Amino acid sequence: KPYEKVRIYRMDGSYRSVELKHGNNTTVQQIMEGMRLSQETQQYFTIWICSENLSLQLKPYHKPLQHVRDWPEILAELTNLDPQRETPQLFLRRDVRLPLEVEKQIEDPLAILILFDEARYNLLKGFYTAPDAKLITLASLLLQIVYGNYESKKHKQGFLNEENLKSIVPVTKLKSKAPHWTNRILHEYKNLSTSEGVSKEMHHLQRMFLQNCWEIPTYGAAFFTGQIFTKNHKVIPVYVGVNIKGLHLLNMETKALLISLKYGCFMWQLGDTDTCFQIHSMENKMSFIVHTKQAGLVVKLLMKLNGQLM
């Protein structure tokens, strides 16, 4: 009755309340046990702590409510933001260390829908760079998943307005490029619905969406914030994407993919004070420095995910 509890959110804005059996000393491991997940579902996910401008994956031993309590100090350590705009929340999200090989193993419908929701969130936010063709395929799969079977009478004309397009294309493409895709999306949408060889089972359609995402360079990336200086010395705010594939820089403003490097094709060096890191592109005559108080976290994660490949 006088028990403490916390909301664990997902990217779609849904949440599950979990009892805190040890109050603010309750660990990630204990909260994960408190979720309605089998060990089949649990192993792919962990608790993240996220405010608008900082997302951290927590480890089984971490005490998430103490991170909530200490958030202003964590922001001051890792960022140059003001803590007024940032009260953090706890999220269930993909473990950044999950190998793509293991994720391709997954048959569990709940695990698939959680990965699917997170993948869709990243697509719509513009964190996935892919050719117009790939994005149109993903848009067609979201139409089948969200709106059901194509019907000429409903979908042919005056359906894909900006309201409906917003839910199936990246926000970065919505205004300028997406409106010219409408006919190609609807064609692939019709092709899905009228293809009896394509399973209409929800977890089957969601895995198809994920299949198309697995080939995107930034897929399953943890994103950090930093700045690069151009060679006169213009400051460019960047997202640093670190995933099981390598390192990815996005222009923060446009989400444009500036560089994508696979593990084994680049080296890193941590700055003297964890305020910057240097990338050298092995056999590419290219070098750049990212300024970020998250430099220590970026290099730590690069070391872990590079080391994971055997």
Binding site: K5, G13, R16, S17, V18, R36, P109, L110, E163, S167
Partner: protein, 164 residues
């Protein structure tokens, strides 16, 4: 896209979570894990318009009932056809909602769940229909979270009631 705040209410074990998870995720929850408070989001089409459902799956007992009822636009009152006590408990919930809302015009549906357990039926279909009529001709369905009978219709009917 219009937002709809739906609340699933009822005593412990009736299948509030099972119905919600079946509707939202297309999965049947086998394990009985007593709910604290869960919120689900689902885009649906009702009467040719895209609707964003926010479904609050509540605890079988108390806490935040008055708050749920103040904020909620539509209420699924769920009993198990397997458990007389769960049917008896719904009268108190109905009256509480009308009290907090301060009107009899509240979007609401009476749901007799676990209609796949025909053999174990303690509450008759006619007794369910009888209660709904008494509740100012309240909407009534017999449902199954396992068999997927009248699962979608619970939430669609509440959206239609909110739209009137």
């Amino acid at each position: 896209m219009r937002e709809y705040k739906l609340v699933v209410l009822g005593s412990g074990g009736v299948g509030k979570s099972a119905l919600t998870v079946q509707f939202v995720q297309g999965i049947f929850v086998e394990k009985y894990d007593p709910t604290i408070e869960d919120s689900y989001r689902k885009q649906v089409e009702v009467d040719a318009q895209q609707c964003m459902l926010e479904i609050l799956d509540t605890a079988g007992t108390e806490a935040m009932r008055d708050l749920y009822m103040k904020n909620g636009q539509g209420f699924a009152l769920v009993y198990s056809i397997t458990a007389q006590s769960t049917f008896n408990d719904l009268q108190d919930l109905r009256e509480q909602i009308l009290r907090v809302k301060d009107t009899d015009d509240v979007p609401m549906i009476l749901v007799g769940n676990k209609c796949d357990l025909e053999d174990e039926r303690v509450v008759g279909k006619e007794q369910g229909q009888n209660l709904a009529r008494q509740w100012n001709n309240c909407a009534f369905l017999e449902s199954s979270a396992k068999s997927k009978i009248n699962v979608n219709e619970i939430f669609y009917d509440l959206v239609r009631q909110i739209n009137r």
